[PDB]
Design a protein around this ligand. Sequence first.
Ligand code: HEM
Ligand code: OH
Length: 154
Amino acid sequence: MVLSEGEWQLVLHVWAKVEADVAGHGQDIYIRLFKSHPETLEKFDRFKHLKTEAEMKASEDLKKQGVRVLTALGAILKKKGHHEAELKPLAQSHATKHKIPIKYLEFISEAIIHVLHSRHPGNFGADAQGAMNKALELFRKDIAAKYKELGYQG
Ligand code: HEM
Ligand SMILES: [O-]
């Protein structure tokens, strides 16, 4: 699905708030993901031992990974759909090495939306959330197509 420029601006206006503290947002998103869908934590060899939210919050390595995820996603969002180059390395590692199903990308998308909804009411009202969902649906659609090209059912 193709986003309008207005939709992209709603996406980028809340992403600007994430960027005040990408590390803190990444921690909240990972905690939400692992709490809501615990099976996703099992895909992380370095983090699957974490037992509680306190341990997740105290993990410097998890914090760094959160920053990587959100910075990679931010670069994709800033391309406003013209993210072919950015999806190549990401799809390859996630399909072949990490083996992350599309359903798990749906789960992290849900966690992103949940955290933006709680933190950023000023920039994440209904229309803004709809635009972000559209952007994440586009991301997942295009990643799923790349997964298939790479040989992974997803
Ligand atoms: C918005 C969706 C996501 C983005 C933008 C993203 C981005 C990244 C990036 C940039 C890296 C480091 C480089 C690489 O290996 O590709 C990474 C690593 C990884 N990703 Fe993702 N990721 C996403 C979703 C997920 C999900 C949902 C899972 C599992 C449920 C996952 C599992 C992993 C694992 C296991 C690693 C290796 C982590 C480590 O260094 O210990 N990713 N991801
Ligand atoms: O990730």
